[PDB]
Every structure is written in structure tokens, then in C-alpha cells.
Design a protein around this ligand. Sequence first.
Ligand SMILES: [Zn+2]
Ligand SMILES: [Zn+2]
Lengths: 846, 846
Amino acid sequence: EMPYPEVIVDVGRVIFGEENRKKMTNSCLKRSENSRIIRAICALLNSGGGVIKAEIDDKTYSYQCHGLGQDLETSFQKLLPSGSQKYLDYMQQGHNLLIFVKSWSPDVFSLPLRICSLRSNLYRRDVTSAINLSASSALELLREKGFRAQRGEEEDMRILASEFFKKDKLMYKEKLNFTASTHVAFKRFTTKKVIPRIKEMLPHYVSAFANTQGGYVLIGVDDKSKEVVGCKWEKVNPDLLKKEIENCIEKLPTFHFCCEKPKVNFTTKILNVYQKDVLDGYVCVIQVEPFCCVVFAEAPDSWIMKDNSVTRLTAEQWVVMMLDYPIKVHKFKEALQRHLFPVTQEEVQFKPESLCKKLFSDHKELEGLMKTLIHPCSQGIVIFSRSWAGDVGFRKEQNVLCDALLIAVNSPVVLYTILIDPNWPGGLEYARNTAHQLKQKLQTVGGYTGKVCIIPRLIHLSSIPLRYPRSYRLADEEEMEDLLQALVVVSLSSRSLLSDQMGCEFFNLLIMEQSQLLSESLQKTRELFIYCFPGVRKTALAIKIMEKIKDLFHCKPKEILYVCESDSLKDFVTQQTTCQAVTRKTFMQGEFLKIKHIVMDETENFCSKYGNWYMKAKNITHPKAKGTGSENLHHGILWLFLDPFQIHHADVNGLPPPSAQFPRKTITSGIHCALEIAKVMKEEMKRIKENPPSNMSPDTLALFSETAYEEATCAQALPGVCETKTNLTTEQIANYVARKCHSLFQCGYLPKDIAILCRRGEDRGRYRLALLKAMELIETHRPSEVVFSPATGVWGSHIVLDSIQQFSGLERTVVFGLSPECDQSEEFHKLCFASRAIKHLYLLYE
Amino acid sequence: EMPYPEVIVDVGRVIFGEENRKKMTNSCLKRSENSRIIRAICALLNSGGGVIKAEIDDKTYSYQCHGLGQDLETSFQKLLPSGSQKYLDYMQQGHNLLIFVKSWSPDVFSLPLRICSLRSNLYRRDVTSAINLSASSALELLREKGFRAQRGEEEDMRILASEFFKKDKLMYKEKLNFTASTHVAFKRFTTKKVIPRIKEMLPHYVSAFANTQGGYVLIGVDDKSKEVVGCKWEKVNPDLLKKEIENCIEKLPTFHFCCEKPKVNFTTKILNVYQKDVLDGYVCVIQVEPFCCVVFAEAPDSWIMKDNSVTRLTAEQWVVMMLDYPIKVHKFKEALQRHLFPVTQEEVQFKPESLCKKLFSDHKELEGLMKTLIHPCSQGIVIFSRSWAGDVGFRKEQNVLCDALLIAVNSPVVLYTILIDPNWPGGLEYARNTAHQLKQKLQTVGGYTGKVCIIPRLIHLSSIPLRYPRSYRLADEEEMEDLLQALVVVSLSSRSLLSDQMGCEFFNLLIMEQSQLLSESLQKTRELFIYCFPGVRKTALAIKIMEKIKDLFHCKPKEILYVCESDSLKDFVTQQTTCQAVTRKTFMQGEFLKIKHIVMDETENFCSKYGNWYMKAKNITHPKAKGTGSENLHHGILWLFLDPFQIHHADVNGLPPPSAQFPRKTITSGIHCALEIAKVMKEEMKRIKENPPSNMSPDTLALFSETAYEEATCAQALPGVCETKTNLTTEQIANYVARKCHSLFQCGYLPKDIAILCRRGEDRGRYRLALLKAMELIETHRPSEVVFSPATGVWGSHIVLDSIQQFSGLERTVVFGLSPECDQSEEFHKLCFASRAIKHLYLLYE
Ligand SMILES: [Zn+2]
Ligand SMILES: [Zn+2]
């Protein structure tokens, strides 16, 4: 029933036509419907953007033949002071009129107003006028009064109304010579019902002589030439003002920047007049001292919808909205977009590649007429996935198979839906929902200040369209640039597959900027000891420094050398760079006589049982061209990579007896894990600090400081998933662990992207038992086969069964777990797992 | 004749009264005088601030009895959108009314508008109205169009109106269905003289359909219900438009952000109507392509006075003003003010003490009845000096002795003048100058955004005042804080004694931040080699690091040592700190077996003839608690201070054979000289780079770069003086050198500040006299005596005669010179000047 994407606010029989905006003499219903339209439009404008539905006034109405009018567009012009041509679009459809709005996100070339208001309800005092304020003047007043509260003929006449204040006995009609200034107002009303006149006149003047200067308010004196006229003593009485002026000035909403909260200092007093024993009137005087903070007239005009209805705000709800991962994405966003989603003039591109290889594999007919279903066109990107609402965060539906999101130049963004079973009441509603929560992210998280719409459609490829006002489509290259950029920002903030496809390029773009700042220090020092945190990616950062070493030193690409421990991280470091990568059983064995420098990694793994490493490294390179036999004194480079918190080898290296002291650089600006994976490490690091083991020296914990993480973690980590499972012994896990991994690779994860990690690495061949064949006990659901190869478990496209000590350093996206309860005291294995997973961590602690 | 401080503008017989702002039916002269008032007032707002003179309307006028009015204050309200209660004050004086203004400097809590405009003369296209832009909307339009030029049922009516463009024939009165939208406007006129209506009307619509979107302009179509009425063919003709529409749209002042600079792309064509062979009118069509840059309608309303009269600006002169030492003064301003000019509740203080010790000394009656001359009061600061116009920069007079600049809380700032001779035409002309060139140095680059006034007075202490509207005086402690803070900035940008008194505290304020950013590196490294520039003040920075060493290491204040070369810089470092200061003939003689650290200075000067410095320095501390005999391995500090450009000893010191390579820190953020003194060093350093001598090694020149200065001298140097003299040999200079130095210490420079720096250090037996016996050849002007003591020439209050190698490291404010032509190849003595002077450099090269 009426498939639509966005927040409909049903209004009624309001009239967007010139004949009624010129003709209508019945002004009451006209102003009521005008106030309703302005309130609903500004409500959706300030809340989240969206679509406004309205009805039709005339039976042969059209937008072109009737125009818009004068009153409504003048109201819209006063509501929007910067520009109305970026947030207001119209259309008509049958017995329907359709208005569009957008999120009020101001650009960087204007004053920051977070929400717009009609009138800010904060009155000030000019020379003679009590004016209402716009958004900018209210913002500068709030900033000025906040900075003042955080810190701690013109002025003549001000002291002349003090004589009028302390008078108590006044002669009738006496035009005393004080006039209007920046400290006195003297506005009179002499009506019959004098109570609501107080609450419509002074909430203004009481704040006017509280946000500028001073204060004095009179009742009973005309405003032409400071004339007193008085009234008859039956019409005016000296009692009927004070009973309700107090009830007036108590309900004014008030905000306070301070904490020693005062109140408004009303000092009202009534004066009398006696001349010739015949009375002819009196004067009422109100004294208001200056206020330390802001005082509002009424409830502010910032209308924001709530609970699917229109709602009014309060003052304390107004000030906090009038005033005030997340940083580097917005910097590297353009280089991410120009590499992952390139926009050129070739044919259309099915951009998520790993899902299209599965959809072609299982459902041969589905990847056929799908190319014929969109349009014959060239400029475009198709993002093909499973449930996009569940990708951006929602419940997934069991019936839905796939959906597509199409971005093109002169074509709107659409969203098709593939459905297997004919669930027509249960499908289209879901097809509506993803066309809302995908836009309200791309205009909030992504920061796209542009007009875009996503149209829901259902295709049902197992065997009444809408309309949009021809400007919500894209225009040229630069708008599709911004839309793909905002989609990159949104996809790097949700738990999906496309997040894991973008985070690697984001990490590489960060590693380049970190290696630049290390190459800046390459100019100054020759030696450097680097103290790393758990999760630093020393291996990714130690590759980009070698090209800077070569480009700055002007030497050969063979004269730079790299030291590792095992063959596992010797692989994948043999590629991706140009150096002589060796193991610990090889750098202790290789006789490098044409060495020039040393840039090593994994410094915590050196055995003192056979030979030495530090003495050999300080006997190979530290005897460089020194001594009197060589005038050439070129100096070498010894960059070690110490991970001191994760020291687990009790044999002495030669670094602890000098405590590894040299020119230091603790790099707390390198961390690449998930936001919950880093939180598990944050929770686990402060257990060893409060309880060190029997082998670790507690002197190395002074270099670590708290609040280095959750600032570095807040600046350089990404969201993801982190699961847990309880009470699975190895007999109980024999059928439970197979089911949770069967549905994983259907979502787009390649079998290269996942890895089954196991605790007990000494039972490795036994761990080829009880899982691999158990994996076969879940391969009897889809006809296929799997191969597990722990020997060449680095570059195989198949799933790699690997251990924590067998698979060190190199990372992967999806990491599994299995843990029998080994010891009651040995709780160190949790320190291993989350040091290797990137985004998706599935862990089974038992 | 009318003693006044500021920029008076003779206006005339304008009326600031309510009776003529309500009564005057002759609207022509009324609106003309209103335009003159608004133009002159906004001219002095935008130009520099000042005062405005005016006459009187009524013979019994008073400001309180008549008020202000409505029209003028509404014009002032539209001119000032933020607030009028900070730039507009009034008074009346006899047959004269006076207005006051202030410089338009916006605060940090608002949008930066550098000059206020009435209307920016830049029209835009709304829904149906062609509005005029305010300053903020014009600013955001210019920023948006500049950022765009730097980079590279409502919309289809733009397509529907093209059949009205390429039609060329039409039938009469046909109500075609296009209306007013964001791409087509159709404003008509059917008058008799159609030329000047084009000149006044369409520049607006041409700026409307160039700064948003599209363009179309018609003539001859009614705006009520898209009606065509036409005119008779005698009244309208098809020729009398095109002859002058092109002359209209050519003179529009246009600014260009782009490079190709196109014109406005008019594509106009005239259209006709034939029906039944009965002509009844026609319609014209103007076509305007969207313009890449802004197009102004007329000359802008931003008025700025020039050549003592009112002047109008052009658009290219408008855009550059509507769009866009110097950074650290504004940060350390508060700490300078709270120490040099303290504001308390004690009695008045005569703050420059050196001139008050002189005026009492020579002219004891002057400091007598002067304390009674000001007022009996307590809260205030008196600033005596010499010619204050000369201190700001202006020609000094030959008779003036003193003038007082008095700051007080509830009293305005004033200025007196002490005069000897009865020269009354020559006095007041002086007194009116300095109360103009001081305030117009404070409200500009000093940065005072407040109201202040300085009153010229004359006293003529041998043995008709002005009036100000009681807000130009200060109010409380914060206004006096702000004025003293701005006067510190004003005094630290001119050539004065008070400048030389404030710079010595500004340097000590910057030394703390430099030492903090150096002591941040104490956690990281133990050894560090510091390469310094000529002028670094290593001696001032090598004192504040020792308190950080103590407070971070928690050791005794006698375990820190300091190495120097001579006894001269051993003095002044014996005091001012707590360490064991020694010389090169003492650190290579003393046996310091207690010490742990070494922080040395002046590393360039070591003699390798009899012994070694570096081998003993690396055999004392580098055998610290090392080896197997001590488990404790605490590590020391060896900070050397190398000035590599200024080495002149070619012996083997121990730094050249390893090229002094260690962990490096080349400090280009330490320089304390003058802005014109350091330019001599900049023009002298790049002579040695292009011509090194036979004893200097060119390998160390790679560390110094050009543009390592000009961001160091730009950020850490102060203004000053640098003079020269030519062809004064020692027979010619013997009577010439005495005259230029006798007039120096009378200006306010205390003794121990100035010092005579002679060049030839070997001929001191000649140099002790020839200048001393010349000195009392010029002390026959004022009866006094002189004492010269080069032996203890460091802390003596007498004037110090000193040499370049005899006086090194320590600085004096005023330096001198005497250089006979020694050799045609020896051009290094000019290098010895500018490393020792601070601000005042007097040089005599022969
Ligand atoms: Zn408060
Ligand atoms: Zn241009």
C-alpha cells in the first residue's frame, strides 16, 4: 500500500496556489494552514530531511498554470536566509502534491548554524526598538555571554530615571525629561484586561534589558514626546498589576552558563499621583537588574518533529542544539574513491566481484537478463550485495537473496529486490526500509550535502513506479564523485562485507602517511629503538620505509636487508618489497659481507641456548668503515622493532642488560584492528599491569601510558564484529562448530579471506582431525569440496587451518577459534588471538 | 585654533532632531543630507575611526529634550546588523554637535567582515524576487564562486521557454504558459524613454541569472497571470532597444577569479508579432549565459574616505577588501602585561624608572608639583617618555622635554607636554599629532577593540579642554588590562626605549617555551648534537633546561655541570643558575669525579695544541657505571652546542673527524636579534656560501638551508635601528665619534645598557684611550664624569668598553663600532657585529 521510501508527514487540504494566496479574505484558516505548513516543512528540514505529502485544492490544478504566489514564498525566504534553491523542490501527482527537503547541513563557506529557526526568541534593545534576533545574532550573543560567564547624554539620563524610581509622590501629566535610550523603556498599555498584555509585552523587554544593559520599564506614559496622560481612577487601580506581574515573570524559560544560578531580580513598585486633592492617574514601575545569562521570551521557534508527529522544543533543548575513524576518513576519502570506485566513460561495472562469482555459480539464470534489466547504458556502477539494511545495521530477512544499488549520471539511484518465494506482503515493506536507512546514513555519517533519492523496486527473478523532480538525479562527474565518497565513509562505519573490502585500502593510505613521518626522522637519527604496542602492524610499516631509504640514500635495492624469525613471515616479506629477507636460523647463519644497513622485525624471538644475536649484529655492522684504516666514515642504520608488552621469551637477548636503551621512538600512531578487537586488548592489557607474571620485568611498563589507547584507538580503528560462545567441551563442540561457519562464505567472503585459528598448536595434526572431517559433516548442505593446507598456509585461495604460533605477523579478516580449558592459571592465550584478526573476530573461549 | 586630536569631517547644517525627522515635507534636501550623513559615517567606520563634527538645527537645541528620531536610527540599524551599541556615541557643544565612531574590527565570535557595506551591489535570483545581498551572503557567494573557479515540474520550464527563444514569429496577446522560476524572469516596462530604465533595471537581473543559474530576460509581458498586452507600433519600435542595451551591459564592473577572462555572453535577438495583417506590438528577448565569476550591478556602497574628503570605491578595489613578532606577541601578551604593567589598588606608579631618575636629576622642579598636577588618586599608571610621536615614528622636535601618557580607571587617557621656550604656535600643532598617531596604532595592529581617547594638553612647567561621552574612559580592571595589553603590542613594533624595555621580557617568555619543547626530548634521547645559527642565544636556553633536568631526574642541584671557554661567559653563568661553571682552561684542569651529566656551551672553541678536549670528555663521562663490575647502568647526558657557521679554529677538535654525527637537532626556532640586524646576517651569510675560505669545510653547509630563516626571523625578531657611516679614518673619526654618542643616554637609555665595541682586539693600549680621552671631549656639554672598566666589564653600571673576542656570548642592547681598513682580503669583522647586538645597532665601517 503506497510504496514510498521516506518520512511522510500527512498534512491535508492546504493550498499551494496563487488564487487562494491572493483571494482569501477568511484570514483565520489561511494563517492556520500557513503556520501548519511552515511548521511541518521546518520540522522535517531540521530533523533529518525527507518528503512532504500534501493534497490538491482545485480539480484542474497544475503547477505551471498557477505558479506559487507571494505569501508562502516570502515566508520561505525569511525562513531560509542563505539560499532557498538547495532545499526546496516541488512536484504534483494526481490528487497529490509532493515537496522535498534535505538535511540542514551548512557548507564550510558559511557560519555554522546547526538548526535553523524562524525567530530565535531572544529579544534585544536597540536605540528605540525591541528587536527579535536572527540565528547569527543569537549565536554571537550566546557565545559572548558564555565567554563572559566563563571569565568571571548617552550614559547621562540613565541616572535621571533613578529620581523617577525613588519618587513615590508625582505630579500629574509631568513630562519628565528622560527619554528612550539603551537603559530605559517606557511602553504603556491602558486596556481593560491588563493581564495577558504583560505576558505578550515584557518577556521581550525583560530579556532586552538583560542581554544588553541595565533596566527600567514603565506603565502609564505616552511615547510621542515623553508625555504622561494618566487615566481615570475607576479604569485603572493600584492593585490589579502586582498580582499578575509576578505570575508573568516566573515562567520564562531560562538557560544558565554558570552554576551559582540566580533569578531575575524583579523590583516592581507602584507610584501614586496627588495634585490639588484630585487624582487623575498613576504610574507603575518595574526594575530589572542585568542578568548573568540568557533569558528567553517564549518557547523557541525551532520546530523538530518527533513520534511521527509535529513537536515543539524547549529552551534547554534549544541551546544544546544551537551550540555544539572520524577524522582521517574525511581526509583520505578522495584517494579511496579514485582507487576503489573509479568513475570514467567505460561500460557499467559490477563492482563487488566476490559476490558475482557466487551468484553466477549457483544461479546461472540470475546473472543473465539482469544486465538487460537495468538499461542499455555505459556510465554506471552496480553495487550488488545481500541485504543492505542488514549491511548498514538491521535484522536480516530469511527469504531475500540479493539486491542491487545502481549509481549513474543521468539516472536516479534505485534499489531492486530479488525474492525467491512469492511473499508479496512480506517483501515490499522490507524494500521500503532499505530506501530510508541507507539515505539517512549517507546524509548524516557521510556528509553528502547533495540531493539524492533511492527508488524501491522488486523484480522476483526466480522465474506503479514513483517520480522524482529531475534534480535529485546526479548531474556530472563531480556529483557522482561526492556520492561515491559519502558511500565510502558510510561503508567504513558498518559491519558488512564492503567494509572489509575498503578497510585494507584505508589501512594502506594510513601506512603511507606514517612511513612519511618516520622517513622524516630518518634524516636526523641513524639508530632508533622502536617500542610498539600489540596491534601495531610493524610488518606493513617496515616495507614503505625501504623505498624512502633507497630514494634518499641513492643506493642499490639489494643493499638493504631485513631480519625475521620463521619461514612464515619470511614469506609475504620475500614479495611486496626488494630486500634480502632471512630467518633467525639464517641471519645467524648467513655471512653477509656486502651488507650496508639493517631494518629488522620481530625482535622478541632470539634464543640464547645456541649462539648469540645481539653480539653478532653488533659485530657485523657496528664494525663498519671505522678505525684509522679508512677515512670514509659512512654510518649505518639499525632500526629494531620491539614489542615489549608481548615479550614471551625468557632467554636474554642482550637488550635487557642495557634495558634496550638508545634514541627511542614509541610509535603510538600505528594501530590496525577492529574497534572491539582493540577493546578486548585494552581490557586484557590492564590485567598484566595489575598482576605481572613470574618472568616479566615490570620496569618496561613505564613507557606505556594510559589514554594512549582510546585516542589512538579512537583515531585509527574501524568497527566490526566480536562474538563469544560458552560451555563447549571438545565432545560438545564436535557438531556445534560446523554450523556457524557454513553460512559465512555465501555473503561474499572468499575462502582465502577466512582462517580457522586453534589454541593448542602442539596438537596440530590432531587438529587436522576433529575439524576437517567435521567440516565435511557440514559440507553435506551445498555440493562442493574444501582443502585445508597448513604447510603452504599463506597464499592459498583455500581455507587455511592455522595456529597462533604457526601463523604469526601476517593478518587476515575473519579469524575463528577453539579452546579447551587447559590450565586454571595460564590465561595468556587470549593475548594471542586478537593480535591477528582485523575486523571480524569469532572467538569460542571455553 | 580648536585643539582636537582626530580626523574631523566638516559636514554642515544637518539635523539630528525628531522634529525635522517627522516634519520635513521637502524630501529632496532631507534625503540628500541623510545620504551625506550615512556616507560620511560609514566612511569613517570603514577607514580608520575618528570623530565627526556637525552643526546645530535649532537655536535652543538639546539632545535630551528632542531625542533622536526614527529614520536616521533605522538607517543606522540597517547599516549595523550585529550591534549599534558599540560604535555610536553622541554629544552637543554650543553651536556644534559631535558624533563619535570606532574602527570596524569584528570580534572572534562573529563572521569576519573586514569592511561593512550598506548594500553589496550583487543581486541574486530567488523564487520570484531579485533580492540584494547583505555582506554575509555576498561573502559566501564570493567564497563559493572562488572555490568553484579554483576547482575546474519546475526544471523543464527552462526547456519549455526555448520555443519562445527560437520562434522568430508570434501571434498577439497569447498567454504562453511559462512563469517565474529559477531560470526565467520576465520583468517588463513600457515607458517612453526606454534607455535609462535598462541601465537601472537589468544589471540586477544580469547579476541574478549569473550567480545562480541560467538566464532569460523579456520586455513586454505582464507579471500578473503571464499576460501579453503589447503596445501600439507608434509607441514601441523594433529598433530603439538594441542600440543601447549593448551600451548598458558593457560598463558593469567585473571581478575575475579565472584566467581566460570572458565577457558576459549576451545573445539577444528582437522578435515581432503579425496577426491578420493588424500589428499590435512585439516582445524583445535577452539571453544571458551563466557567468563564471561575479558581476556587480553598479559601484559598491562600501564608502571609504580619502584625501580628507569622501570617496567612492570600485569593484576591484572592493573584492580585495571584502576578502582577505606577528603571532607570538598576541599569545604572550597577557604574561607580558601582568608582569610589566601590573594593575592593582595601590598608589600611582611612575613606571619607566630610567627617565624619572634623570628628570629629577637635571630639572628637579619638574618632578615636584607634577604629582599634584594630575589628581589626588591611586589607581593608575603614568608612562613618562621623550617625544611620543618620535617613539611611534615621526620627526622629533628640538625643544620638547617630556610628555605624560596617563592611564586610569575612571579617568580618560590624556597627554600633556613639557616645554621650555615660549613657542605657542609650535606647541599645540605638536600636541594634536600624537593623540592621532598613537590611537591609530592601538586600534589597528596593537589590536584594541575598545573605546579610548587621548586628550592633548600643555602645561609649560618653567617653574579650553575638550569633552568625551563618558564611555571612552575605562570601566574596570579588564578594560585597563586590554589597553595595557594592546600598548605592549604597539611598543613592541617601534624603535623606542620602552621597546627595548619590553623586548627583554618577551625574549625570556619565549625561552621558556623553547626550553619546554627541548625538555620534551629528555625522555627520548640521552645524547644530542645541536647545530645552531648565528644569533641563537644558546646561553639563555642552556639555563632553563637544568631545572627540567632536576625536576625530572630528582637529583641534587650540584650534579649538573657547564663548560665554557673564557672567564667572561663564566661570569653571568656563575649567577642566574645553580651549576658548576668552568672555563676551557678549567674543565681541562679540574678533576670532577662526582659529576654524572654534562650540559656544555660554546663547543666551537677548543685548542688542540697542548692537549685534547673531546678525548678527555669521552674518557670522563663515557666510562660511567658500565662493564661487568657494576650492575647499575644509569646513562648520562652529553649535550654539545655547536655553532657550525661561525667556527674559525681549524685544529683537530674531535667534532670534524666524525663530522660531529650523532642524534641531531638543528634548532631553527631560536633567534633573538632585531628585524634589521638579522637582515645584515642574512645578507652576510650567503657570501660565505658562494665564496668559502681556504680553512673552512664546505661539508657542513648542507644543514643550513635558505628559507630556514624568513620564518624564524619573521617569527622571533623585533623592529629596531641600524645605521652606517662612511670615510672616518682614525684622524677624521677622532672628533666625529664623540658627538653621536652623547645624546643617547638622555633619551632614556640607562647606563650598563650601551657599550662601545671596538674591532682591533690587540691594540687595547691604544683603544683604552683615544676614545676615553675623546669621551670627555664631549662631556663638556653636561657637567658629569665617565668611568670605563673593561676588566670587570660585565656587571658594572658604568659604560663598558669591550672587544669582539673579549666580550662574547653576553648581549647588550646598544652596540657601537670603529673599524679602520685592515686588509683587502679580511672581510670577516662584519660577521662579528650582529651576533652581539639586540635591537640598536650602530656601525661605522671604514
Ligand atoms: Zn549564570
Ligand atoms: Zn572568469
